[PDB]
Design a binder for this molecule. Structure first.
Ligand SMILES: [Mn+2]
Ligand SMILES: [Mn+2]
Ligand SMILES: [Mn+2]
Ligand SMILES: [Mn+2]
Ligand SMILES: [Mn+2]
Ligand SMILES: [Mn+2]
Ligand SMILES: [Mn+2]
Ligand SMILES: [Mn+2]
Ligand SMILES: [Mn+2]
Ligand SMILES: [Mn+2]
Ligand SMILES: [Mn+2]
Ligand SMILES: [Mn+2]
Ligand SMILES: [Mn+2]
Ligand SMILES: [Mn+2]
Ligand SMILES: [Mn+2]
Lengths: 100, 98, 79, 104, 109, 96, 98, 86
DNA sequence: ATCAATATCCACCTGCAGATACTACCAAAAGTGTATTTGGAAACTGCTCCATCAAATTAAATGTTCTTAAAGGTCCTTTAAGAACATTTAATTTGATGGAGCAGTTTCCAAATACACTTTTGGTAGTATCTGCAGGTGGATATTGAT
DNA sequence: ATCAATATCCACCTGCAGATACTACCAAAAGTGTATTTGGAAACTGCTCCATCAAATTAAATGTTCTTAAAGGACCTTTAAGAACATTTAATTTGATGGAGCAGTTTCCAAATACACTTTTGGTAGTATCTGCAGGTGGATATTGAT
């Protein structure tokens, strides 16, 4: 174990996988396909959080809330994706808030 | 009785409009189109006059700029008449579509 | 009506300013198409900003920011 | 119990919160934000894997590859637009020949 | 007070302000004490170059007051400025006069 | 009844007075210059923001600005701006 | 001897090359080109193996994207043969040049 | 230690190679005049990206260019590329 | 080249919008000065991977011969779009006038941040055995171009 | 609507390169729970400016009628680019070696924040005075297309 410890490089890899097994339980994914898939999550993370960044700022808000993300999403994603994402986003925040 | 060559007023109008900067669409109609369209996203919206004006200024940039590119397309087809296929081609290559 | 409110001569004025000399008959409907698409895209974003800031008035900043994220940045209203 | 589970998501609510703070997108970051964002990213992950999933199978293959991801994206209007200016390494292109080029 | 941070560097633009704008704009946790100085200067320079280029634009057109259309000319003539703002549209700035030479008097001239 | 709408109007003017003291500016055209100044400020501070992030730095220094200016402005314009940038920082630290 | 008519091997090469995803420029030549250019910005650089690969990918991706547009400009002028003017029009409309 | 004079490697991009590209691009017929033109563009492209890539390398005071150096380059270039990190 | 038909460029003039000038108020901003936390530059260096080199192997480039159907050009006809003027249709401009709602201002509390000790887990790492598919094969079927 | 040469198709098999699977360790993360602070929701209210009259006043669009030249189609000649093969150049592959330099770590202060207190001003309102040029004709010269 260890060569003076090389620091931790994280990626959404295990989650991308879990979700792959949720839709396609008999399907794989190469490292090259996983890497791509990993860039896709970061790309969209950034894109959204940057839109939400600007959105708060325009409104003189110092806080990015579920609503900043929500609007960011509807500005960023096209028709149907925006439709379903909003639907999932609201589903999750609801489940989380009244979960205690 | 006077008659000019087909195309000479055109050139007069080009030099004329390229010299000037006034918005070439009549203010009102455009203002109706903005409302009509905006109505589909949220009903009973009020518009700052500046905000409708911003939108016209840009609509106008867009189309002129697009007519430049549309022009270079018709010219490319060894023609001097802009035609839909020119507009469709310029837009395909710009990324609006594809 | 409405989209027809954008007059054949007005489209000509823009082709002229853009340096076009001779114009096909079909260009006008095609241009009417194009602009509506341009307006739908920008106004959708404009209104989103308008909605998000719980306003009932589409201000100019809204329009400005819509145009900025459409990649079509506009100066001289944005303050 | 984790916040991910607490919101009923595979993606990491904990991590997504952290990254939001690390990026300085705003001075404060509410508790709602990382949840929605994980959600949306999970859904999007799911949409694209579904599609490529099927693309893999169409081509008689069980291991998804970047090619399958391209075929997924470029064949789907909305996904193709969102990734409008994105390049999928080793993805190739959709087989497409212009009509006027085919022999007659 | 004693000295404005602006004059200390021979800059008209508000160093002090720019520094503050950087903090509340959420660009990084910390902002170094020389950062805005550099930046203010750069903004001055760029403001200087166009004003200068458009100040000239008002000459060739007889006027002592810069209107929008001057700025347009100032930019769309400078190859390097045209590029920097190739994605910007200036309000009420019209175009640069240009006609494709296959459109001119008697055939392709 | 007072909320400050702080703009670059006067600093534009001070500079206009230097390059061209016999010349004035319409508000239409001044506004354009206020838009220009902010736009560019954003682009550069944004680009600088990314730089420090890429290099896991928590501080934006004069150096980040510099590289950003090189990344953003075209060769010759980037050339002049760097010089004027280094002047300002040097003169400012040379000061009493 | 059996001879194929002009533009059938061509079409066969189109299908062949759209169906696959390998890189079509040779590893080494391309790699030299990178190093040669990178020299004008820095003497004695070093290049991560994957940092080059990253560039070839985008390059080939880009050059294929351009040829598609080029092809639509050729076709626009009732040509089937791309020509330098097509590459230039396409880049002009893209706003890569003028 | 060598570090050879690399000059005009642009000719290493062969006429046959440029063909295969146009082909995947879906181009049936290529003017002989294209090959030079295409060597033009590729050269402009690479210049643009490596210019930016290396600026990042300098900014991190590195002598090695990392794939992230090219990935960020290309991002701010307008040509986002997946699967090489970031 | 002759010449009349408009179009343009030239000077000169002038009313008012839209800049600008002068007072004065002030909250918020820009500085200063003073105690106090911390980011990363210096240094050192483990050890990762990049430059390079040879030799064999293997793949692609090239330069050349033959040909044909693409480009490109001339000369034809078809009819679509400019120029123009006579109407009609619409847009602007004014003036007055409701009252939507954006923006200020003061609450107050749900929800943010803090710094603290507590528990989990994703990644690194090492060691080891699987497995999906390229890639090569043959033999059978579809395509193409000459009939 | 037949023939043959050639490509494309799938079935079947084998090797290895990457994919998966043990295991075991750990720092940074993600959790539970405290204590303090604070954003911005809400509720209000004051007035800026958005909407909408009808009604004179200006300016533009739409329709029509003769007209010309542009678009596109058919024919014909030039040639340049595809197909194919003999020849030769170059890339790639395997394999092993030397060293730069990236990135992991301990350290520690010029330089950051953090905080009160002092001074300054850039924005706003109000009031008024000023002026640069639009838009107005005047009448030489200039361009364009009838002779
Ligand atoms: Mn030049
Ligand atoms: Mn032809
Ligand atoms: Mn020819
Ligand atoms: Mn016809
Ligand atoms: Mn009310
Ligand atoms: Mn685990
Ligand atoms: Mn196979
Ligand atoms: Mn075989
Ligand atoms: Mn068989
Ligand atoms: Mn408060
Ligand atoms: Mn023709
Ligand atoms: Mn060393
Ligand atoms: Mn003052
Ligand atoms: Mn005038
Ligand atoms: Mn007159």
């Amino acid at each position: 174990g260890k060569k003076r410890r090389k620091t931790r490089k994280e990626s959404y890899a295990i989650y991308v996988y879990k979700v792959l097994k949720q839709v396609h339980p008999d399907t794989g994914i190469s490292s090259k396909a996983m890497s791509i898939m990993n860039s896709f999550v970061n790309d969209v993370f950034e894109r959204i959080a940057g839109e939400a960044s600007r959105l708060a700022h325009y409104n003189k808000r110092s806080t990015i809330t579920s609503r900043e993300i929500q609007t960011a999403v509807r500005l960023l994603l096209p028709g149907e994706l925006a439709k379903h994402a909003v639907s999932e986003g609201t589903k999750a925040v609801t489940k989380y808030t009244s979960a205690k | 009785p006077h008659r000019y060559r087909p195309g000479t007023v055109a050139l007069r109008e080009i030099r004329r409009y390229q010299k000037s900067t006034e918005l070439l669409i009549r203010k009102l109609p455009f203002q109706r189109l903005v409302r009509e369209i905006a109505q589909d996203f949220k009903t009973d919206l009020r518009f700052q006059s500046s905000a409708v004006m911003a939108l016209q200024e840009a609509s106008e940039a867009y189309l002129v700029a697009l007519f430049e590119d549309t022009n270079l397309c018709a010219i490319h087809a060894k023609r001097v008449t802009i035609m839909p296929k020119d507009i469709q081609l310029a837009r395909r290559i710009r990324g609006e579509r594809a | 009506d409405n989209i027809q409110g954008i007059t054949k001569p007005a489209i000509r004025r823009l082709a002229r300013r853009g340096g076009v000399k001779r114009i096909s008959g079909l260009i006008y409907e095609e241009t009417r198409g194009v602009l509506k698409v341009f307006l739908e895209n920008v106004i959708r974003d404009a209104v989103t900003y308008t909605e998000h800031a719980k306003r009932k008035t589409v201000t100019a900043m809204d329009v400005v920011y819509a145009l900025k994220r459409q990649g079509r940045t506009l100066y001289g209203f944005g303050g | 119990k984790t916040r991910s589970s607490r919101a009923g998501l595979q993606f990491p609510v904990g991590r997504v919160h952290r990254l939001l703070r690390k990026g300085n997108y705003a001075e404060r970051v509410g508790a709602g934000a990382p949840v929605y964002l994980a959600a949306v990213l999970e859904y999007l992950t799911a949409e694209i894997l579904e599609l490529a999933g099927n693309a893999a199978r169409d081509n008689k293959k069980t291991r998804i590859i970047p090619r399958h991801l391209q075929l997924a994206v470029r064949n789907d209007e909305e996904l193709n637009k969102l990734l409008g200016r994105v390049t999928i390494a080793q993805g190739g292109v959709l087989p497409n020949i212009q009509s006027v080029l085919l022999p007659k």
